[PDB]
Nucleic acid binder design. Structure first.
Length: 1280
RNA sequence: AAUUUCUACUGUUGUAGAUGAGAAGUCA
DNA sequence: TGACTTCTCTAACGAGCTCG
DNA sequence: CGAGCTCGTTAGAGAAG
């Protein structure tokens, strides 16, 4: 029987059921008449015009907290010393010191911000509404905008001036419940974490590493060039700009021209860093544009362009000075129309190309001159770095025709340079190091050429020539701008979406190409650019001339990845607008509690006429319909208005009502009890109120202070309806678990009848707006299975729920409304034969008596109802969930038949039920989805869309209509994974995407396979089966909670519940029977160096009766230690070889017939029947050894597509213990069948040894769930 | 080619499966 | 480029307000 | 300014590895 009987109703989560309202009776006629929904646009669309007001005031607060901060020089001298140690000498134990050196400067400001006076009333209610004596801070500044005559609008923003903004900001009087995600996603702007958009993460990582860099290029400038910077001219010329009102070390209030000898001081760090101080610093260092003289009076960086120009020294051009970047939330829009689909692009290629710079070098010539200055080795090669991730692999792709030739040369040269006989430092100098210099690259490429002939060289000059193939890409952009200027005169229309239709295919493919040769252009400069990453915080001895001109042409060119995603998210949408908004019935309280006592203001209540469900929203002004005297007066039959009783919090309510100004006399205790609440002695560790202090808990308190609550609850007027069943008060350890005694039992839901004729008349009177929630299950024309957001709603109100409560209703439901997006167009009229679209369905015809408008749910207005509920409310929460599982299946480990999912070359997954020994019980593909009614082949449905016999092969409309259908496949297949893990009650084991993941070209990408393990963790955390009994396990309330929730992809680790994780390195290229891995990689390193490598083979011999040659090897005679054992690989069957398609598509080559040819071509004899050891090693030729490697580039290839997309079977070199060779044309059911069946059976074998560790668990709860290749390659081979 | 929304649908005024919503700095 | 925060998941009371 | 009147305060567990 299923072992997961225990894993039922375990923890709590809150899904939100959504519905459509039906305006019934005369509900909609009163709404349109009084102007209700038309005056709802002005406070559900218009707050986006108020989110332009709040952030601008949130920008004025930046200007008046950073010009009001004064940080010490003690934490700048503790920064700048470590800031210059790591440049000249980077190490490990100073990174812990550098982080703590910058931790208490990003926290010392983070405690100054949270202790100001404009901050506590800015992320809460009181930002926008005024107190009776305290007028709020938004309305003061907009009046202060008039108090000084400032003209903040009609020059920068959308609103005319502040006078209409004075009207707009008073449209949110009691409406403070809007901004609660707009005021939660701006607590990251003042967050002390490492998130990359703040003002305290930025002034420690974007200007403080740039200002202290720019001080070393000023102390090393006055001694090396005294005459250069004319001090006496910049005092007179820019005297108005240099009026810095405050100094640091003297705290002057002297509005005077500062001295340039002291503005570059480390102590003077606080004279800037608002929006108007970085402007002042970048006025001197970049020049001041004043067009009153028709010339530029350019500052100190013009003096470097005069002093080093005359005497002609390019070492003072190393000492140029940089530009500080502009602060986050400066003064600087998602796309929906087509009037601005072109001028968000044609007004960018005017900005990225047609602009005159400061020093007069156009951006075509900047990458032209600098890469030509790098061409003949002029710049220093030990200061320009490569990004050491697999983006440098792409730099080896375009010119070296190999992926890992650079990453091996910086592993081969560093091997001989430091530890030439391999032991500790050898990894992090070239592998874990985030950057490698060109001097390290050049001394690794003119060393590998010394051990290689003329045919296969690897020249450093080709990398310099590859970068010279960059600066003429800007010339064909200047040719495409002559092509893409005839389209901007064709789209002058405002909102019509004729660039999204399928007729202009010849005008969208002129845009994807132009946004692809400016998106690999940024992916070839990506290997240069410095990263401000974490755990290394990358700082090295950088170049002084390269990385100042490169930042001119990267961070101005980097504004295309937030612009390429503004088009590919515009073309790949659907032709209707899902722009909905919430409607409120002239009330800031729509569904907040649903409670019976608090519903003249919660405004809403539900109904049931014994089959379907309704919503009744009372009109807020005349809401006197159900004030407890018209229910008994109108009792009868019909609707079944609920009384809903809720008690949120046994921390927040039970001291609020039992120690109030009213009910304190009704439950009168002695002063023995009153000393507890004052000093907070009942709490183990909490918070007393003002007046007293915290004391120590004793066991006498919370076995009698709870008894105060038992007499207080049992005499309450409206809190006797719950019927509490509290346990024995001696068995109460704390009040945190007496919370859980009050909170779950403080919830009842029973029914009271109302005569149907009254509340059919009050909707006719116009006081009860009545609505019906429905789906395709709550209509009368259905018989099949419901949805899951309708099988939950029918369990909020069932009687078997309310016995032992599971589905709790929550407050703050939210009513939404959606306008008319697309017009009504009947695409399938009545009595017309329509075409089938399934290649297995017999009934090819389709004639409908009723019409079908194309997706008509976006043609007519829909009132919505988004209703959060709570699942398993009575039970506990989620603490140490995955540790409970491993401590449970230890006595149930011999019931667990491990399921295992992979990616796919030909398939999409190959889920495989591996047994404990390893014999596959039931494997099947994941291309055929469904029960015997209809069957759908998503493999064939991909293969007709996936860039196959389609229009133009490159447009964005394909590559998401693959992906959304591929994502819609992920919505399908998670049910067919869930059915297996209950029928075969085991586990899921995916492939992790942290480290150790598969690399090749698959259908399922890296992107759309982490979502299939994201959409499985949120459909195995709460798992309901639509065809199971209600009160039985696996049903609706007694359902499957087997995993934990989803926090991040990083926090999945090796285990997040029943879904384990294993690596995905070397699982698809292994013989399943014996465990061979091709670790003896042939690459044709040299002619003579291969000769001792063929003697590292034990014997290259032949057998008479066997009839096949063999390359016997053992791994003890060569490095990169992976496994052991005498192999004697064979040359039995045929191996296909892939080729460059386009003709030269596919041809078959036999290994043995090639070995018969290529060995009889020279004088080597074989036919005696013994070893050919010395004969193969004795031969010396260029062509011979460059061709025998192509035999070993074929005898070890274990994937072979038979023709174009037919089938790829599996072959095995290494023998069994009998003599037979594994061949998947005759493989049994307990062995893999296809090529993707071998990439899934080893993901289970590497997952089955997780379960070997877990069944042998001990008292040490430090379960080594990590996999090393020495552990896996030993387990898979000798398991029998 | 119909849906609380999404994907494929004819599975027939809808069938099989998924659905956590308002939110939204945006790393790159 | 697809994920990075962590909450509100609420009833009752003391409050100045037409009214008494 | 008590009639109670629609508001904007306000009461303040112990999990979180």
């Amino acid at each position: 029987m299923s072992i997961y009987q225990e894993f039922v109703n375990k923890y709590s989560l809150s899904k939100t059921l959504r519905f459509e309202l039906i305006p019934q009776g005369k509900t909609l006629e009163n709404i349109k008449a009084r102007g209700l929904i038309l005056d709802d646009e002005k406070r559900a669309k218009d707050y986006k015009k108020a989110k332009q007001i709040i952030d601008k005031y949130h920008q004025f607060f930046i200007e008046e907290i950073l010009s009001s901060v004064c940080i010490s020089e003690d934490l700048l001298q503790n920064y700048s010393d470590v800031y210059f140690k790591l440049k000249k000498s980077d190490d490990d134990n100073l990174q812990k010191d550098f982080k703590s050196a910058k931790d208490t400067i990003k926290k010392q400001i983070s405690e100054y911000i949270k202790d100001s006076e404009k901050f506590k009333n800015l992320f809460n209610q009181n930002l926008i509404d005024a107190k009776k004596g305290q007028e709020s801070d938004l309305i003061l500044w907009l009046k202060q905008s008039k108090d000084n005559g400032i003209e903040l609008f009609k020059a920068n923003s959308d609103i005319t001036d502040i006078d209409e903004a004075l009207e707009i900001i008073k449209s949110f009087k009691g409406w403070t419940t809007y901004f609660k995600g707009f005021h939660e996603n701006r607590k990251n702007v003042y967050s002390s974490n490492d998130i990359p958009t703040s003002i305290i993460y930025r002034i420690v990582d974007d200007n403080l590493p740039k200002f202290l860099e720019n001080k070393a290029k000023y102390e090393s400038l006055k001694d090396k060039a005294p005459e250069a910077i004319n001090y006496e001219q910049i005092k007179k010329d820019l005297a108005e700009e240099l009026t810095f009102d405050i100094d640091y070390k003297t705290s002057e209030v002297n509005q005077r021209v500062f001295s340039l000898d002291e503005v570059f001081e480390i102590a003077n760090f606080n004279n800037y860093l608002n929006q108007s101080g970085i402007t002042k610093f970048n006025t001197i260092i970049g020049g001041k544009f004043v067009n009153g003289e028709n010339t530029k009076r350019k500052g100190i960086n013009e003096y470097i362009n005069l002093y080093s120009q005359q005497i002609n020294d390019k070492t003072l051009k190393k000492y140029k000075m940089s530009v500080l970047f502009k602060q986050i939330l400066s003064d600087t829009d998602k796309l929906e129309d087509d009037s601005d689909v072109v001028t968000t692009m044609q007004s960018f290629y005017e900005q990225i190309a047609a602009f005159k710079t400061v020093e007069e070098k156009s951006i075509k010539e900047t990458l032209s001159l600098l890469f030509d200055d790098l061409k003949a080795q002029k710049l220093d090669l030990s200061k320009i770095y490569f990004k050491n991730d697999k983006s440098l692999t792409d730099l080896s792709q375009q010119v070296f025709d190999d992926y890992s030739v650079i990453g091996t040369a910086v592993l081969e040269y560093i091997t001989q340079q430091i530890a030439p006989k391999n032991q500790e430092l050898i990894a992090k100098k070239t592998e874990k190091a985030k950057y490698l210099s060109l001097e390290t690259i050049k001394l690794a490429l003119e060393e590998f050429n010394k051990h290689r002939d003329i045919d296969k060289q690897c020249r450093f000059e080709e990398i310099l020539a590859n970068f010279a193939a960059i600066p003429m890409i800007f010339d064909e952009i200047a040719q495409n701008k002559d092509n893409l200027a005839q389209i901007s005169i064709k789209y002058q229309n405002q909102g019509k979406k004729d660039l999204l239709q399928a007729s202009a295919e010849d005008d969208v493919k002129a845009i994807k190409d132009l946004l692809d040769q400016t998106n690999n252009l940024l992916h070839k400069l990506k290997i240069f650019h410095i990263s401000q990453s974490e755990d290394k915080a990358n700082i090295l001895d950088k170049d002084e001339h390269f990385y100042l001109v490169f930042e001119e042409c990267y961070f101005e060119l980097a504004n295309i990845v937030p612009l390429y995603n503004k088009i590919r998210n515009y073309i790949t949408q659907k032709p209707y607008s899902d722009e909905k908004f919430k409607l409120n019935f002239e009330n800031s309280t729509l569904a907040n509690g649903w409670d019976k006592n608090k519903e003249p203001d919660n405004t809403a209540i539900l109904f049931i006429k014994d089959d379907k469900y309704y919503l009744g929203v009372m009109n807020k002004k005349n809401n006197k319909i159900f004030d407890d005297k018209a229910i008994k007066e109108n009792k009868g039959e019909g609707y079944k208005k609920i009384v809903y009783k809720l008690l949120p919090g046994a921390n927040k309510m039970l001291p609020k009502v039992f120690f109030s100004a009213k009910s304190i006399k009704f439950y009168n205790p002695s002063e023995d009890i009153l000393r507890i609440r004052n000093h907070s002695t009942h709490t183990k560790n909490g918070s007393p109120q003002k007046g007293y202090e915290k004391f120590e808990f004793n066991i006498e308190d919370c076995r009698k202070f709870i008894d105060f609550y038992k007499q207080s609850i049992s005499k309450h007027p409206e809190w006797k309806d719950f019927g509490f069943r509290f346990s024995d008060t001696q068995r109460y350890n704390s009040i945190d678990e007496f919370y859980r005694e009050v909170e779950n039992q403080g919830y009842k839901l029973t029914f009271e009848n109302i005569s149907e004729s009254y509340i059919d008349s009050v909707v006719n009177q116009g006081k009860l707006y009545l609505f019906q929630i429905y789906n395709k299950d709550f209509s009368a024309y259905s018989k099949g299975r419901p949805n899951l957001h309708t099988l939950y709603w029918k369990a909020l109100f069932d009687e078997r729920n309310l016995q032992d409560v599971v589905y709790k209703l929550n407050g703050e439901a939210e009513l939404f409304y959606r306008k008319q997006s697309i017009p009504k167009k009947i695409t399938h009229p009545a009595k017309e034969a329509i075409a089938n679209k399934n290649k297995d369905n017999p009934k090819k015809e389709s004639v409908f008596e009723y019409d079908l408008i194309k997706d008509k749910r976006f043609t007519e207005d829909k009132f919505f109802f988004h209703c959060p509920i709570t699942i398993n409310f009575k039970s506990s929460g989620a603490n140490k969930f995955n540790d409970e599982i491993n401590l449970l299946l230890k006595e149930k480990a011999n019931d667990v038949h491990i399921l295992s999912i992979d990616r796919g070359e030909r398939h999409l997954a190959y889920y495989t039920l591996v047994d404990g020994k390893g014999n596959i019980i039931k494997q099947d593909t994941f291309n055929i989805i469904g029960n015997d009614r209809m069957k759908t082949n998503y493999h064939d449905k991909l293969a007709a869309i996936e860039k196959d016999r389609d229009s133009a092969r490159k447009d964005w409309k394909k590559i998401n209509n693959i992906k959304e259908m591929k994502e819609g496949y992920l919505s399908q297949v998670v049910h067919e994974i869930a059915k297996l893990v209950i029928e075969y009650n085991a586990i899921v084991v995916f492939q992790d995407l942290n480290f150790g993941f598969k690399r090749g070209r698959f259908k399922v990408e890296k992107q759309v396979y982490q979502k299939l393990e994201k959409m499985l963790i949120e459909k195995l955390n709460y798992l309901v089966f639509k065809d199971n009994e209600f009160d039985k396990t696996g049903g609706v309330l007694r359902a499957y909670q087997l995993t934990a929730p989803f926090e991040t992809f990083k926090k999945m680790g090796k285990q997040t519940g029943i879904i384990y994780y294993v690596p995905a390195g070397f699982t698809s290229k292994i013989c399943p029977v014996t465990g061979f891995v091709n670790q003896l990689y042939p690459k044709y390193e040299s002619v003579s160096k291969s000769q001792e490598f063929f003697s590292k083979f034990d014997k290259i011999c032949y057998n008479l009766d066997k009839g096949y040659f063999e390359f016997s090897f053992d791994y003890k005679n060569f490095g990169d230690k992976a496994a052991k054992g005498k192999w004697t690989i064979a040359s039995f069957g045929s191996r296909l070889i892939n080729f460059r398609n386009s003709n030269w598509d596919t041809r078959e080559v036999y290994p043995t017939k090639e070995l018969e040819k290529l060995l009889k071509d020279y004088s080597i004899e074989y036919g005696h029947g013994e070893c050919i050891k010395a004969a193969i090693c004795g031969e010396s030729d260029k062509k011979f050894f460059a061709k025998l490697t192509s035999v070993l580039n074929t005898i070890l290839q274990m994937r072979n597509s038979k023709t174009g997309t037919e089938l790829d079977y599996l072959i095995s070199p290494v023998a069994d213990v009998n003599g037979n060779f594994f061949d998947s044309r005759q493989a049994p059911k307990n062995m893999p069948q296809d090529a993707d069946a071998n990439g899934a059976y080893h993901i289970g074998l590497k997952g089955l040894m997780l379960l070997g560790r877990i069944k042998n668990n001990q008292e040490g709860k430090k379960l080594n769930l990590v996999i090393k290749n020495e552990e896996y390659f030993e387990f898979v081979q000798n398991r029998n």
